[PDB]
Amino acid sequence: EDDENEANEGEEDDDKDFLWPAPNEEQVTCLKMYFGHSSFKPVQWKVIHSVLEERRDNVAVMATGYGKSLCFQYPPVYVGKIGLVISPLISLMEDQVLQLKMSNIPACFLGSAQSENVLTDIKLGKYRIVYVTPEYCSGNMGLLQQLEADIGITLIAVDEAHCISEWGHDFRDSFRKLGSLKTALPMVPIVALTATASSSIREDIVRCLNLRNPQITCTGFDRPNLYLEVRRKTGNILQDLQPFLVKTSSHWEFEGPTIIYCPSRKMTQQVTGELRKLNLSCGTYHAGMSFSTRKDIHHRFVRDEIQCVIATIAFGMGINKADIRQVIHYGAPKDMESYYQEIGRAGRDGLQSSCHVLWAPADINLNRHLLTEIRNEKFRLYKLKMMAKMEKYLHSSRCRRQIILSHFEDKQVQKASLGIMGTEKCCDNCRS
């Protein structure tokens, strides 16, 4: 019988079309053969590609185990070398080793009692994936150095990585000496995994594991407190933003802390100018500004001395602010990936927030003419596909939450979202 009906008339859209660079044919064959999947989710590819091609440290926040294991199991299987998984979760490690064996991936649990059986075979390069406790790993840095020299370690995964922080709710003394991994193995990337989206605990993990410029990702969350809306521009900045404003004592303000993302530096200045006329507490943020001025706006926003930052998408990576009540995209966003990163900064305190896109078909990020100028065929086609996916989202009458979760998240996240989805607080299209 037919197992899916994903194909639609008027589209040749695979999940691979929205990955940069594209997975090659052997990478797809490997994924199918050893993991029984046809495609990578964007976050899975971000982690896998950063490990394989850049040897980059990662902190991967993953709310659940749905789609998690692929990020650290796939790279060593693809290159045919060795990946180490450090975890205190014995039963889960046993379950994953058996699943790998049943997929014809040579994997084992290494510990003191298991060493007589597996250690010689690990040293000779017969295992793709080795699971160890932090206690065992801490007394065997010599072994890891030999495996790096003789085989080459694709990555070290540290699961329950929040256990390294004495400031968290689940501290393990066993994790303390994992700080030595980067000293013993400076060229081996670490993928630190945790379920906690706490910026405080992320900083502790990066410090304690000595991670260098780690790629930070955060997935598996439904974010029921984010309301999504897409609305047409009206041809006038004050006309467009007036609906978001309330008059208080001869000055106007937003409901709460607000970020307005604009495509151009020019537009950030234009929008700031119109809000300044209303004596609204706001500041401009773009790369054309000085280091001190940018640093000042950051601190002032964090201290609630300004209510609104009008910014390019240069603003956001350095802000851990939990009470962002409103994100406005003033102009179509660059693509769905950037849009996802930007709306994800809203309502991290878990209270009701709104994310509005104000767009016109004439917006710079819907202009195909700028993309036709791209002479690299592969990059041109990717940029056109990303613009088309963004345009399809903006134009849609379907649930905005369903579109975003379908693209970025494991299907399990959609099952958790069925409560918020279709209600008055989900999105503009669910309210109608």
Ligand X SMILES: C[C@H]1CC2(CCN(C(=O)c3ncccc3O)CC2)c2c1n(CC(=O)Nc1ccc(C(F)(F)F)cc1Cl)c1nc(N3CCOCC3)nn1c2=O
Contacts to ligand X by CB under 6 A: 197, 216, 218, 221, 223, 226, 228, 316-317, 340-341, 343-345, 348, 350, 401, 404-405
Rounded to whole angstroms, the Cα distance separating 115 from 60 reads 30
- Asked if residue 321 lies in contact with residue 292, where contact means CB atoms within 8 angstroms, the answer is no
DSSP state of 51: I
**Least distance CB 216 / ligand X (angstroms):** 4
- Asked if residue 174 lies in contact with residue 132, where contact means CB atoms within 8 angstroms, the answer is no
Tell me if residue 286 falls in helix, strand or coil: coil
Q: Is position 163 annotated in a ligand binding site?
A: no
**Least distance CB 3 / Zn ion (angstroms):** 27
Choose the stretch contacting Zn ion; rule: CB under 5 A; options: 95-103, 146-154, 243-251, 398-406.
Answer: 398-406
Of 399, 403, 404, 413, which lies in the binding site for Zn ion, with binding defined by CB under 5 A?
399
Q: Does 230 bind Zn ion (CB under 5 A)?
A: no
Q: Which of 266, 311, 259 is nearest to 285 (CA)?
A: 311
| Dihedral sign computed on CA atoms, order 294, 297, 303, 308 | negative
**104 versus 397: smaller Cβ distance to ligand X:** 397
**Least distance CB 338 / ligand X (angstroms):** 10
**227 versus 330: smaller Cβ distance to Zn ion:** 227
Of these partners, Zn ion, ligand X, none, which one is at the site of residue 343 (CB under 5 to 8 Å by kind)?
ligand X
Q: Does 426 bind Zn ion (CB under 5 A)?
A: yes
Rounded to whole angstroms, the Cα distance separating 341 from 144 reads 36
Q: Is position 69 annotated in a ligand binding site?
A: no
Tell me if residue 119 falls in helix, strand or coil: helix
Cis-peptide, bond into residue 21, ω within 30° of zero: yes
Rounded to whole angstroms, the Cα distance separating 214 from 219 reads 16
Of 76, 401, 403, 413, which lies in the binding site for Zn ion, with binding defined by CB under 5 A?
401
Q: Is position 44 annotated in a ligand binding site?
A: yes
**Least distance CB 402 / ligand X (angstroms):** 9
Of these partners, ligand X, Zn ion, none, which one is at the site of residue 31 (CB under 5 to 8 Å by kind)?
none
- The terminus-to-terminus CA distance of the chain in angstroms comes to 36
As a whole number of angstroms, the longest Cα–Cα distance in the chain is: 79
Choose the stretch contacting Zn ion; rule: CB under 5 A; options: 164-172, 191-199, 317-325, 423-431.
Answer: 423-431
DSSP state of 106: -
**110 versus 226: smaller Cβ distance to ligand X:** 226
**Least distance CB 420 / ligand X (angstroms):** 8
142 Cα distance to chain centroid: 34
Rounded to whole angstroms, the Cα distance separating 129 from 71 reads 13
Q: What number of CA atoms fall less than 13 Å from residue 230's CA on the CB side?
A: 22
Tell me if residue 171 falls in helix, strand or coil: coil
- Residues facing 157 on adjacent strands: 85, 191
Q: Is position 65 annotated in a ligand binding site?
A: yes
**122 versus 259: smaller Cβ distance to ligand X:** 259
Of these partners, ligand X, Zn ion, none, which one is at the site of residue 399 (CB under 5 to 8 Å by kind)?
Zn ion
Binders of Zn ion: how many residues, by CB under 5 A?
5
Q: Is position 426 annotated in a ligand binding site?
A: yes
Q: Is position 103 annotated in a ligand binding site?
A: no
Which residue has its beta carbon closest to ligand X?
A: 344
Of these partners, ligand X, Zn ion, none, which one is at the site of residue 226 (CB under 5 to 8 Å by kind)?
ligand X
Ordered DSSP codes for 322-362 = S---EEEEES--S-HHHHHHHHTTS-TTSS-EEEEEEE-TT
Rounded to whole angstroms, the Cα distance separating 83 from 131 reads 9
Q: Does 182 bind Zn ion (CB under 5 A)?
A: no
**385 versus 407: smaller Cβ distance to ligand X:** 407
**Beta strand pairing call for 107-109 and 258-261:** unpaired
**Least distance CB 181 / ligand X (angstroms):** 21
**88 versus 422: smaller Cβ distance to Zn ion:** 422
Of these partners, ligand X, Zn ion, none, which one is at the site of residue 344 (CB under 5 to 8 Å by kind)?
ligand X
Of these partners, Zn ion, ligand X, none, which one is at the site of residue 427 (CB under 5 to 8 Å by kind)?
Zn ion
Backbone torsion region of residue 263, taken as left when φ is above 0, otherwise alpha when ψ lies between -120 and 50, otherwise beta: alpha
Bind-site residues for ATP: 37, 39, 41, 44, 65
List interacting residues with Zn ion (CB under 5 A).
399, 401, 426-427, 430
Bind-site residues for Zn(2+): 399, 426-427, 430
Bind-site residues: 37, 39, 41, 44, 65, 399, 426-427, 430
